[PDB]
Amino acid sequence: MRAQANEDIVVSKTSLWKEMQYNRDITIRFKFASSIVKSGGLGYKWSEISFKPANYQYTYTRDGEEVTAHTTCSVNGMNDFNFNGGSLPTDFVISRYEVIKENSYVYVDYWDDSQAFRNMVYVRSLAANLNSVICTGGDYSFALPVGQWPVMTGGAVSLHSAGVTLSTQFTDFVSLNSLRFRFRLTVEEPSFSITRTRVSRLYGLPAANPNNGKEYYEVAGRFSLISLVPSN
Amino acid sequence: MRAQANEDIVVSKTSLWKEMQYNRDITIRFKFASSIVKSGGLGYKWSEISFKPANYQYTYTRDGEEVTAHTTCSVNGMNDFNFNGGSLPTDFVISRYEVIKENSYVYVDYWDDSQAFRNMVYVRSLAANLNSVICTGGDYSFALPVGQWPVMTGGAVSLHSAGVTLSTQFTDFVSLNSLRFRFRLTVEEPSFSITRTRVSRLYGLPAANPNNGKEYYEVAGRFSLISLVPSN
Amino acid sequence: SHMRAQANEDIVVSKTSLWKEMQYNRDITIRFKFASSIVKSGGLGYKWSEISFKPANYQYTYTRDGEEVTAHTTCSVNGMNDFNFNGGSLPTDFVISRYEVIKENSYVYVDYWDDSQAFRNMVYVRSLAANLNSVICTGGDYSFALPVGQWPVMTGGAVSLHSAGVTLSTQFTDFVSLNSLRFRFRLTVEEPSFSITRTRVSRLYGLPAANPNNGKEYYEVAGRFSLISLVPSN
């Protein structure tokens, strides 16, 4: 029997161990990170534009109280694209840039300072309900030493909750007991392109500017689970 | 008391915790992965040839049922070799390539979807028996801009079981409770060499093409252990 | 309830048929060291692109009550600060694109494990407390050997580490995964400042990643700790 959105319900009790039913409403805020590396030489060539795990620490209000949360966003199933403007030192070139599409997965680990994430190691009856969110690509200019600047623009995917499992966010200090939410992707308008090139009408989200100026992407949800935790 | 190759026997049980004797025959299939990086200039030079962890997911039959397994192969203690065929821009070179020998170790993490690996965190009386396996190097052509092509060829080591400990395979999604099998190596025939050079009669397994066209290497074995796990 | 009797001991706080709460009290000698990744700028020889900190492992043994203790530590840093020196763009101009320095806004973490009973199955801990001495880390010299000209030398720098919290962690070695305690150390910058000879860089405070160990085999922090751990009875 439940009574409120955010609650801890004792399921079983033993001297040292207890099974707790934890139900939490959560506000998941996260962001992507990118690794953009330029090649040597005159400055017309980029060797890599790829995704990398991004952390985000924040606070929000739940039941009149301040919640402190930490997320870690990672991706997989990235697709490799490239642009070859020619082999001359002055020819614009991106050797490799990543794009997440419908064959890609975005994962967001979530932890908050409430009791539910305390010693969260053995979970059963895990259930979660999460909203969907659209991520769009911001513009990214490739400042060439001379001439007009090519500009990667567009791109978009919508994230859809598709599974949850336990995970550990290995921060610099504490290793947080977390829930890892997997999101499947659906490509959305607009497609991306690179101005001043023959590249256009491609669908997916490039790793050039996946946050598009936003401080974070937000997904609201809630979970319910039974966790076997120490009694003392 | 035992009865069959694959079984779960309750050693002792309490309302929330229980000790299980898990016995299983296992088919370990794994593989290597390599990072081959080229240097700048004309394209007659390689900067690095090193091993990197490799995952392998597969299925096989055990007592008439389909078992789903996942392995992660990593190596440590590799040896750095190199080839310097000149100073000129147009001269074939390998600045550093890894070779595993008798002073090296290969580790294979194993997990399968049977009850034995669920919540495998506290293990007593861990015992395992594993066959040995031979890993051989396949050819690897160094595609020069001009001239015929060097081809690293040969190389081999036999893996011999040398201990097991618990580990976790941190996959893009689920973090699998696994058994980490360590293997000591013995060099074997054929030695390795690089055609069109004076390199030959060297022993060990180079990182250029350690899988030798195979999809996986296979080691059959069995383990027996007692695991303290949640009752529900 | 339970009472202490000596410096190193295991005390049964509670016991059931599969689980038990043990209080582990220990004197520890924490020995660790830093590691750095130093990379030269290709091309010819007057430029460096990186000098950063990288985690470092250290294995050692020491005595505790007449017995030999085997320990393993992993030192990592966070909140480092990025510095650089640009003495020209021409091939023959001295350049270090980025070198890290830890200051008062940085943290040094030292993960500790030893082969005693206390670290066996350490997963659920409470009443965790530790008393550690402070330790001063100073930077040794680092010469930027060049083609020609008198060589610049990164010299000086110092910070003192002060215990600022402990949490559980795992040291993931090549084989075994060690249940450990991660000690966080906040820093206070100390004299002397650091500088680079043959340049206008001087009077900067903090510990550069060039030669943080100053030739020592290890840095050592000592103390003792006490904690209650929920472990399997068998």
XYZ file of C-alpha atoms in Angstrom:
698
model
C 0.000 0.000 0.000
C 1.347 3.393 -1.063
C 0.413 6.869 0.162
C 2.584 9.492 -1.572
C 4.726 10.020 -4.692
C 8.022 10.044 -2.820
C 8.129 7.430 -0.096
C 10.045 4.582 1.529
C 8.003 1.516 2.465
C 9.391 -1.289 4.593
C 8.677 -4.575 2.817
C 10.558 -6.991 5.067
C 12.759 -6.532 8.099
C 15.595 -8.566 9.578
C 18.212 -7.779 12.233
C 20.866 -6.785 9.689
C 18.932 -6.639 6.400
C 15.672 -5.164 5.163
C 13.737 -4.939 1.905
C 12.585 -1.410 1.178
C 10.075 -0.255 -1.399
C 11.351 3.083 -2.764
C 9.151 5.277 -4.990
C 10.603 8.486 -6.401
C 9.597 11.181 -8.790
C 12.718 12.337 -10.615
C 13.902 15.183 -12.798
C 16.707 13.929 -15.018
C 18.952 16.711 -16.314
C 21.908 15.784 -18.498
C 24.115 16.897 -21.366
C 26.465 15.491 -23.971
C 30.166 16.293 -24.290
C 32.343 16.404 -27.393
C 35.955 15.840 -28.287
C 36.909 18.070 -31.198
C 40.482 17.679 -32.413
C 42.129 19.659 -35.214
C 44.842 18.231 -37.431
C 48.259 19.861 -37.695
C 49.296 22.104 -40.560
C 47.718 25.314 -41.840
C 44.464 24.825 -39.969
C 41.969 23.679 -42.605
C 41.635 20.122 -41.333
C 39.908 18.504 -38.351
C 40.784 14.949 -37.410
C 37.966 14.059 -35.010
C 34.592 15.207 -33.687
C 33.264 12.583 -31.292
C 30.968 12.112 -28.303
C 32.326 11.581 -24.802
C 30.724 10.917 -21.384
C 29.423 14.096 -19.755
C 28.570 14.635 -16.089
C 26.024 17.114 -14.689
C 25.507 18.008 -11.021
C 22.383 19.968 -10.107
C 19.583 20.644 -7.624
C 15.817 20.839 -7.924
C 12.832 20.793 -5.592
C 10.807 17.742 -4.599
C 8.116 17.915 -1.894
C 9.391 21.303 -0.761
C 12.881 19.908 -0.199
C 16.123 20.462 -2.072
C 17.364 17.460 -4.008
C 20.943 17.223 -5.225
C 21.381 14.992 -8.278
C 24.235 13.760 -10.451
C 23.987 12.327 -13.966
C 26.420 10.870 -16.492
C 25.490 10.753 -20.166
C 27.129 8.268 -22.522
C 26.313 7.068 -26.049
C 26.930 3.977 -28.144
C 26.275 2.804 -31.686
C 27.661 6.086 -33.063
C 27.971 6.363 -36.862
C 31.187 7.597 -38.508
C 30.928 10.287 -41.196
C 33.623 12.410 -42.799
C 34.104 15.255 -45.242
C 36.974 15.257 -47.693
C 37.413 18.572 -49.447
C 40.656 17.462 -51.080
C 44.246 16.567 -50.187
C 45.756 20.049 -50.413
C 46.851 21.779 -47.177
C 44.128 24.361 -47.866
C 41.369 21.849 -48.585
C 38.709 21.711 -45.849
C 38.572 18.294 -44.167
C 36.897 16.600 -41.293
C 38.510 13.102 -41.091
C 35.879 11.672 -38.764
C 32.766 12.953 -37.034
C 30.163 10.968 -35.114
C 26.400 10.990 -35.545
C 23.880 9.120 -33.386
C 20.885 7.742 -35.257
C 18.130 5.153 -34.878
C 20.818 2.474 -34.517
C 22.398 4.392 -31.610
C 21.694 4.454 -27.867
C 22.016 7.261 -25.352
C 22.388 6.290 -21.709
C 21.889 8.525 -18.707
C 22.955 7.401 -15.257
C 21.031 9.059 -12.430
C 21.652 9.395 -8.702
C 20.217 11.798 -6.119
C 20.912 12.257 -2.392
C 17.631 10.746 -1.170
C 17.456 7.458 0.770
C 16.482 5.379 -2.274
C 20.002 5.482 -3.802
C 21.566 4.431 -0.499
C 23.280 1.073 -0.872
C 21.188 0.456 -4.010
C 22.816 -2.852 -5.012
C 20.104 -5.549 -5.072
C 16.935 -4.462 -6.823
C 13.807 -6.327 -7.921
C 10.411 -5.171 -9.202
C 12.137 -2.213 -10.865
C 9.664 -0.093 -12.807
C 10.135 3.332 -14.367
C 8.124 5.829 -16.374
C 10.000 8.525 -18.285
C 9.004 11.319 -20.645
C 10.650 11.744 -24.028
C 12.961 14.594 -25.012
C 14.214 16.038 -28.280
C 17.880 16.872 -28.705
C 18.859 19.250 -31.507
C 22.261 20.099 -32.938
C 23.529 23.631 -32.659
C 25.616 25.330 -35.306
C 29.355 24.696 -35.382
C 31.672 26.933 -37.423
C 34.980 25.664 -38.770
C 37.081 28.824 -38.751
C 39.457 28.378 -41.687
C 42.578 30.592 -41.717
C 41.427 32.098 -45.033
C 38.125 32.242 -46.881
C 34.523 31.531 -45.938
C 33.861 29.319 -42.912
C 32.017 26.046 -43.462
C 29.272 25.606 -40.849
C 27.797 22.306 -39.641
C 24.132 22.946 -38.923
C 21.004 21.035 -37.944
C 20.422 17.501 -36.758
C 17.971 16.090 -34.237
C 16.845 12.920 -32.500
C 14.143 12.269 -29.922
C 14.994 10.006 -26.971
C 12.492 7.363 -25.872
C 12.786 5.411 -22.637
C 13.774 1.848 -23.369
C 14.977 -0.018 -20.299
C 16.603 0.629 -16.907
C 19.355 -1.246 -15.061
C 21.653 -0.537 -12.106
C 24.952 1.281 -12.638
C 27.725 3.039 -10.772
C 28.751 6.617 -11.525
C 32.469 6.656 -10.817
C 33.037 10.293 -9.860
C 36.380 11.688 -8.708
C 35.429 10.936 -5.105
C 32.265 8.934 -4.320
C 31.092 6.007 -6.492
C 27.330 6.655 -6.729
C 24.778 3.768 -6.698
C 22.626 4.677 -9.714
C 19.919 3.761 -12.183
C 20.976 3.694 -15.854
C 18.222 4.722 -18.250
C 18.640 3.634 -21.861
C 16.996 5.658 -24.629
C 16.330 4.452 -28.120
C 16.428 7.147 -30.806
C 14.179 8.339 -33.615
C 15.626 10.870 -36.067
C 13.746 14.140 -36.292
C 13.659 17.356 -38.281
C 15.821 19.112 -39.107
C 18.406 17.131 -41.050
C 21.949 18.441 -40.828
C 24.314 19.826 -43.426
C 27.601 21.658 -43.765
C 27.376 25.034 -45.460
C 29.803 25.610 -48.314
C 29.878 21.871 -49.202
C 27.747 19.278 -51.021
C 26.730 17.810 -47.640
C 23.033 18.132 -46.742
C 19.787 16.339 -45.881
C 21.414 13.871 -43.469
C 19.431 12.695 -40.455
C 20.800 12.213 -36.978
C 22.575 14.205 -34.269
C 26.252 15.143 -34.934
C 28.784 15.374 -32.112
C 29.761 18.945 -33.109
C 27.243 20.886 -30.973
C 24.726 18.373 -29.502
C 23.705 20.644 -26.613
C 22.849 23.562 -28.899
C 23.590 26.171 -26.240
C 21.401 24.511 -23.603
C 22.832 23.963 -20.127
C 21.030 20.628 -19.997
C 18.438 18.406 -21.497
C 15.574 17.408 -19.243
C 13.473 14.268 -18.844
C 10.914 13.891 -16.063
C 9.892 10.523 -14.723
C 9.426 8.259 -11.744
C 10.530 4.868 -10.553
C 9.484 2.224 -8.067
C 11.668 -0.594 -6.830
C 12.374 -2.956 -3.993
C 15.915 -2.680 -2.681
C 17.525 -5.069 -0.215
C 19.653 -2.839 2.013
C 21.523 -3.020 5.334
C 19.295 -2.401 8.343
C 21.887 -0.325 10.264
C 26.290 -33.691 -2.579
C 26.528 -33.349 -6.366
C 24.477 -34.962 -9.156
C 25.171 -33.292 -12.517
C 27.451 -31.031 -14.539
C 25.161 -27.999 -14.376
C 23.324 -27.490 -11.108
C 22.402 -25.157 -8.258
C 22.460 -26.642 -4.756
C 21.192 -24.799 -1.689
C 23.935 -24.847 0.946
C 22.009 -22.882 3.582
C 19.138 -20.400 3.519
C 17.535 -17.565 5.516
C 14.434 -15.540 4.620
C 16.516 -12.901 2.851
C 19.882 -14.513 2.099
C 21.032 -17.935 0.939
C 24.287 -19.713 0.076
C 24.262 -21.484 -3.272
C 26.708 -24.022 -4.628
C 26.860 -23.283 -8.367
C 28.410 -25.801 -10.758
C 28.637 -25.181 -14.480
C 30.368 -26.312 -17.618
C 31.295 -23.289 -19.723
C 32.355 -22.549 -23.264
C 34.506 -19.448 -23.341
C 34.691 -17.646 -26.659
C 36.719 -14.459 -26.850
C 38.843 -12.414 -29.198
C 41.391 -9.615 -29.291
C 41.106 -6.082 -30.694
C 43.842 -3.811 -32.070
C 44.534 -0.118 -32.497
C 46.535 0.568 -35.652
C 47.441 4.257 -36.125
C 49.333 5.750 -39.099
C 51.750 8.624 -38.967
C 51.565 11.750 -41.086
C 53.456 12.445 -44.318
C 53.444 10.261 -47.446
C 51.935 7.155 -45.854
C 54.873 4.773 -45.486
C 54.689 5.008 -41.726
C 52.772 3.536 -38.837
C 52.844 5.094 -35.374
C 51.208 2.406 -33.252
C 49.949 -1.187 -33.250
C 48.571 -2.107 -29.840
C 46.037 -4.409 -28.204
C 42.818 -3.051 -26.732
C 39.984 -4.745 -24.813
C 37.481 -6.621 -26.992
C 33.943 -7.806 -26.181
C 32.216 -10.865 -27.658
C 28.587 -11.851 -27.201
C 27.414 -15.280 -28.250
C 25.169 -18.272 -27.680
C 25.779 -21.993 -27.279
C 23.930 -25.066 -26.069
C 24.187 -26.461 -22.546
C 22.006 -29.410 -21.516
C 19.675 -28.739 -24.444
C 19.175 -25.066 -23.594
C 20.446 -21.886 -25.200
C 23.009 -20.082 -23.079
C 23.745 -16.420 -23.821
C 27.277 -15.378 -22.840
C 29.536 -12.317 -23.001
C 33.309 -12.044 -22.654
C 35.852 -9.250 -22.444
C 39.455 -9.923 -23.376
C 42.242 -7.671 -22.136
C 46.025 -8.144 -21.987
C 48.796 -6.744 -19.830
C 52.569 -6.859 -19.871
C 52.953 -6.512 -23.641
C 56.362 -5.930 -25.212
C 57.221 -3.029 -27.485
C 58.879 -3.825 -30.791
C 59.526 -1.594 -33.766
C 60.837 -1.488 -37.301
C 62.879 1.365 -38.691
C 63.463 0.934 -42.422
C 64.838 4.416 -43.054
C 64.700 8.113 -42.255
C 63.219 9.268 -45.519
C 59.634 10.340 -45.810
C 59.332 7.582 -48.297
C 60.719 4.812 -45.864
C 58.622 1.985 -44.333
C 58.498 2.229 -40.520
C 56.573 0.989 -37.487
C 57.353 3.179 -34.483
C 55.873 0.735 -31.987
C 53.964 -2.517 -32.119
C 52.978 -4.745 -29.218
C 53.820 -8.404 -28.812
C 52.656 -10.609 -25.956
C 55.096 -13.293 -24.748
C 55.869 -15.317 -21.656
C 56.035 -12.157 -19.508
C 52.517 -11.213 -20.623
C 49.059 -12.115 -19.332
C 45.735 -12.408 -21.123
C 42.549 -12.009 -19.118
C 39.129 -13.151 -20.237
C 36.065 -12.029 -18.282
C 33.110 -14.398 -18.627
C 29.414 -14.090 -17.867
C 26.381 -16.052 -19.047
C 22.658 -15.630 -18.458
C 22.273 -18.577 -16.066
C 21.379 -18.275 -12.364
C 25.024 -18.709 -11.299
C 26.029 -15.203 -12.421
C 23.069 -13.389 -10.918
C 24.172 -11.326 -7.924
C 27.566 -13.077 -7.922
C 29.345 -10.801 -5.441
C 30.439 -12.961 -2.495
C 32.121 -16.220 -3.528
C 33.749 -19.010 -1.444
C 35.431 -22.261 -2.578
C 35.984 -20.978 -6.114
C 37.444 -23.744 -8.261
C 37.885 -23.951 -12.013
C 39.326 -26.236 -14.661
C 40.140 -24.838 -18.101
C 41.600 -26.224 -21.313
C 44.436 -24.386 -22.987
C 44.199 -22.680 -26.359
C 46.586 -21.558 -29.089
C 46.292 -18.056 -30.544
C 48.049 -17.340 -33.827
C 48.812 -14.138 -35.662
C 47.269 -13.589 -39.061
C 48.906 -11.602 -41.849
C 48.737 -7.832 -41.958
C 49.712 -5.928 -45.091
C 51.204 -2.456 -44.827
C 49.780 -0.737 -47.913
C 52.567 1.555 -49.057
C 51.842 4.378 -51.542
C 54.410 2.750 -53.880
C 56.355 -0.523 -54.215
C 55.431 -3.999 -53.044
C 53.945 -4.427 -49.561
C 55.450 -5.595 -46.275
C 53.288 -8.260 -44.572
C 53.681 -8.987 -40.949
C 53.089 -12.703 -40.662
C 53.176 -15.507 -38.116
C 53.432 -15.398 -34.342
C 51.771 -17.601 -31.738
C 51.255 -18.227 -28.037
C 49.402 -20.889 -26.113
C 47.202 -19.704 -23.222
C 47.319 -21.708 -19.976
C 44.856 -21.116 -17.138
C 46.488 -19.430 -14.157
C 43.871 -18.286 -11.669
C 40.374 -16.857 -11.492
C 38.889 -13.944 -9.559
C 35.615 -12.028 -9.615
C 35.162 -9.043 -11.925
C 32.547 -6.900 -13.597
C 32.164 -6.397 -17.335
C 31.054 -2.796 -17.593
C 28.988 -2.944 -20.793
C 27.405 0.095 -22.474
C 24.293 -0.898 -20.565
C 24.255 -3.707 -17.962
C 27.223 -4.195 -15.643
C 27.762 -7.962 -15.634
C 28.962 -9.921 -12.567
C 31.703 -12.111 -14.045
C 34.609 -14.459 -13.464
C 37.985 -13.165 -14.622
C 40.208 -15.950 -15.916
C 43.919 -15.151 -16.135
C 46.092 -16.991 -18.656
C 49.877 -17.304 -18.647
C 51.527 -17.622 -22.053
C 54.057 -19.892 -23.754
C 55.395 -18.855 -27.164
C 54.795 -21.351 -29.967
C 55.480 -21.863 -33.664
C 55.300 -20.113 -36.007
C 57.650 -17.273 -35.085
C 56.633 -13.985 -36.706
C 58.233 -11.760 -39.318
C 57.712 -8.921 -41.782
C 58.247 -9.770 -45.447
C 60.492 -7.436 -47.429
C 62.607 -6.764 -44.340
C 65.162 -8.541 -42.160
C 62.607 -9.175 -39.407
C 62.018 -12.874 -38.835
C 62.351 -15.669 -36.281
C 60.754 -13.566 -33.521
C 58.487 -15.261 -30.962
C 55.180 -14.128 -29.501
C 51.843 -12.763 -30.723
C 51.916 -9.312 -32.398
C 48.950 -6.945 -32.122
C 48.593 -6.474 -35.913
C 46.148 -9.326 -36.498
C 45.910 -11.524 -33.360
C 42.530 -13.048 -34.305
C 43.958 -14.509 -37.517
C 40.611 -14.299 -39.280
C 38.835 -16.194 -36.522
C 35.569 -14.971 -35.061
C 36.684 -16.054 -31.621
C 39.076 -18.302 -29.846
C 37.543 -21.001 -27.675
C 38.376 -22.503 -24.297
C 36.160 -25.075 -22.625
C 36.082 -25.507 -18.892
C 34.024 -25.717 -15.753
C 33.811 -24.027 -12.417
C 32.431 -24.689 -8.986
C 31.723 -22.051 -6.364
C 29.567 -21.061 -3.424
C 27.780 -17.732 -3.774
C 26.012 -15.771 -1.023
C 22.953 -14.327 -2.742
C 19.556 -12.702 -2.026
C 16.770 -15.253 -1.424
C 14.045 -13.359 -3.295
C 28.340 -2.716 23.778
C 31.749 -3.407 22.239
C 34.932 -1.880 23.639
C 38.367 -1.283 22.118
C 41.472 -3.011 23.488
C 44.326 -2.304 21.056
C 45.420 -0.320 17.983
C 44.845 -3.128 15.462
C 41.859 -5.353 16.084
C 38.681 -6.844 14.743
C 35.714 -6.597 17.066
C 32.474 -8.482 16.634
C 29.700 -5.925 16.950
C 26.958 -8.333 15.887
C 26.646 -11.796 14.365
C 24.050 -13.853 12.506
C 24.358 -17.108 10.528
C 25.337 -15.544 7.178
C 26.166 -11.949 8.125
C 28.061 -10.087 10.822
C 29.084 -6.556 11.697
C 32.785 -6.285 12.421
C 34.568 -3.226 13.715
C 37.995 -2.942 12.165
C 40.551 -0.644 13.715
C 43.908 -0.207 12.059
C 47.077 1.824 12.004
C 47.875 2.589 8.385
C 50.882 3.817 6.529
C 49.738 5.297 3.275
C 52.476 5.452 0.672
C 51.734 6.871 -2.751
C 53.176 8.760 -5.678
C 52.067 10.818 -8.653
C 52.597 10.059 -12.339
C 52.802 12.418 -15.305
C 52.320 12.209 -19.047
C 54.783 14.471 -20.827
C 54.499 14.814 -24.607
C 56.735 16.618 -27.083
C 55.423 18.534 -30.075
C 56.461 16.675 -33.163
C 58.140 18.545 -35.937
C 61.708 19.179 -34.661
C 62.287 19.628 -30.949
C 61.490 22.981 -29.320
C 57.874 22.353 -28.404
C 55.980 20.306 -25.820
C 52.211 19.830 -26.097
C 51.407 18.273 -22.747
C 52.429 17.784 -19.115
C 49.545 16.373 -17.123
C 48.907 14.185 -14.096
C 47.874 10.575 -14.555
C 46.875 8.025 -11.879
C 49.731 6.087 -10.269
C 49.842 2.729 -8.493
C 52.238 1.777 -5.718
C 52.793 -1.570 -4.002
C 54.665 -1.898 -0.748
C 54.905 -3.623 2.584
C 55.383 -2.316 6.083
C 55.189 -3.548 9.649
C 52.179 -3.406 11.955
C 52.487 -5.138 15.343
C 55.427 -7.295 14.231
C 53.613 -8.669 11.167
C 54.258 -7.764 7.532
C 51.504 -5.791 5.844
C 51.077 -5.711 2.064
C 49.344 -2.607 0.705
C 48.379 -1.151 -2.692
C 47.524 2.472 -3.460
C 46.272 4.444 -6.442
C 46.798 8.208 -6.525
C 44.587 10.410 -8.713
C 43.988 14.170 -8.951
C 41.085 16.396 -9.993
C 40.474 20.126 -10.345
C 43.932 20.651 -11.821
C 44.611 24.039 -13.419
C 45.845 24.502 -16.992
C 48.893 26.664 -17.671
C 50.969 27.139 -20.803
C 54.004 28.989 -22.058
C 54.259 30.437 -25.528
C 57.599 31.947 -26.450
C 56.872 32.137 -30.166
C 55.242 30.314 -33.095
C 58.396 29.841 -35.153
C 59.822 26.306 -35.201
C 62.648 27.452 -32.902
C 60.491 29.057 -30.182
C 60.114 27.358 -26.808
C 56.546 26.106 -26.299
C 54.564 23.975 -23.807
C 50.939 24.054 -24.983
C 49.466 22.893 -21.671
C 50.815 21.830 -18.278
C 48.663 21.112 -15.242
C 49.144 22.504 -11.770
C 47.256 21.490 -8.651
C 46.335 24.277 -6.253
C 43.852 24.993 -3.468
C 40.962 24.300 -5.830
C 42.289 20.804 -6.584
C 41.991 17.490 -4.769
C 44.388 14.576 -4.505
C 42.762 11.202 -3.911
C 44.590 8.161 -2.581
C 42.851 4.769 -2.706
C 44.210 2.335 -0.114
C 44.054 -1.443 0.299
C 46.107 -3.922 2.314
C 45.904 -7.685 2.770
C 44.492 -7.613 6.321
C 40.993 -8.801 7.242
C 39.516 -5.286 7.288
C 39.597 -4.933 3.510
C 38.123 -8.379 2.892
C 34.576 -7.927 1.607
C 34.485 -4.181 2.526
C 31.226 -3.083 0.851
C 28.877 -1.771 3.547
C 30.665 0.570 5.948
C 29.529 2.995 8.649
C 31.085 4.818 11.618
C 34.031 5.414 9.280
C 36.755 7.585 10.843
C 40.421 8.298 10.188
C 43.275 10.357 11.618
C 46.040 11.101 9.144
C 49.149 13.260 9.299
C 49.501 15.982 6.695
C 52.116 15.645 3.973
C 54.010 18.198 1.912
C 54.607 17.554 -1.792
C 57.248 19.593 -3.592
C 58.173 19.799 -7.252
C 61.546 18.663 -8.504
C 63.278 20.191 -11.507
C 62.420 19.451 -15.112
C 64.732 20.524 -17.905
C 63.344 21.348 -21.355
C 66.299 20.229 -23.311
C 66.337 21.961 -26.541
C 68.286 22.189 -29.751
C 70.236 25.229 -28.839
C 70.263 27.948 -26.304
C 70.514 27.636 -22.574
C 67.838 25.161 -21.340
C 64.680 26.303 -19.550
C 63.938 24.411 -16.339
C 60.616 24.101 -14.545
C 61.538 24.403 -10.899
C 59.810 24.671 -7.541
C 56.213 24.444 -6.422
C 54.640 22.967 -3.301
C 51.341 22.020 -1.678
C 50.412 20.412 1.614
C 47.745 17.705 1.646
C 45.178 17.640 4.427
C 42.700 14.781 4.918
C 39.208 15.895 3.911
C 36.900 12.891 3.904
C 36.942 9.171 3.158
C 34.664 6.973 1.054
C 34.638 3.430 -0.284
C 36.207 2.718 -3.673
C 37.589 -0.064 -5.813
C 41.080 -0.274 -7.243
C 40.658 -2.023 -10.592
C 44.006 -3.723 -11.214
C 44.745 -5.966 -14.208
C 43.479 -9.018 -12.329
C 41.906 -8.567 -8.875
C 39.535 -5.694 -8.039
C 40.559 -4.400 -4.600
C 37.951 -3.217 -2.071
C 39.478 0.017 -0.835
C 39.134 3.259 1.062
C 39.552 6.459 -0.929
C 41.125 9.273 1.064
C 40.484 12.767 -0.273
C 43.089 15.413 0.481
C 42.350 19.107 0.066
C 45.382 21.245 -0.689
C 47.052 24.358 0.642
C 49.713 25.980 -1.532
C 53.124 26.272 0.133
C 56.491 27.928 -0.427
C 58.416 27.929 -2.619
C 56.583 29.115 -5.730
C 57.490 27.523 -9.049
C 59.063 29.063 -12.136
C 60.704 28.347 -15.476
C 64.328 29.468 -15.827
C 65.141 31.466 -18.968
C 61.576 32.833 -19.186
C 59.324 35.457 -17.546
C 57.384 32.791 -15.659
C 57.945 32.940 -11.916
C 56.343 33.327 -8.485
C 53.468 30.978 -9.319
C 52.066 28.812 -6.526
C 51.034 25.178 -6.716
C 52.522 21.843 -7.773
C 53.201 21.431 -11.532
C 52.850 18.002 -13.163
C 56.465 18.121 -14.474
C 58.235 16.414 -11.551
C 55.730 16.212 -8.629
C 57.600 13.421 -6.842
C 60.847 15.437 -6.536
C 62.888 12.244 -6.784
C 61.194 10.514 -3.833
C 60.195 6.889 -4.216
C 56.927 7.789 -2.483
C 55.058 10.250 -0.288
C 53.754 8.960 2.976
C 50.793 9.806 5.128
C 50.241 7.915 8.325
C 47.491 7.542 10.827
C 44.910 5.012 11.804
C 41.283 4.373 10.997
C 38.215 2.813 12.546
C 35.024 1.666 10.886
C 32.223 -0.863 11.146
C 31.808 -3.221 8.195
C 28.864 -5.520 7.356
C 30.394 -8.733 6.020
C 29.502 -12.408 5.355
C 29.867 -14.722 8.356
C 31.533 -17.603 6.495
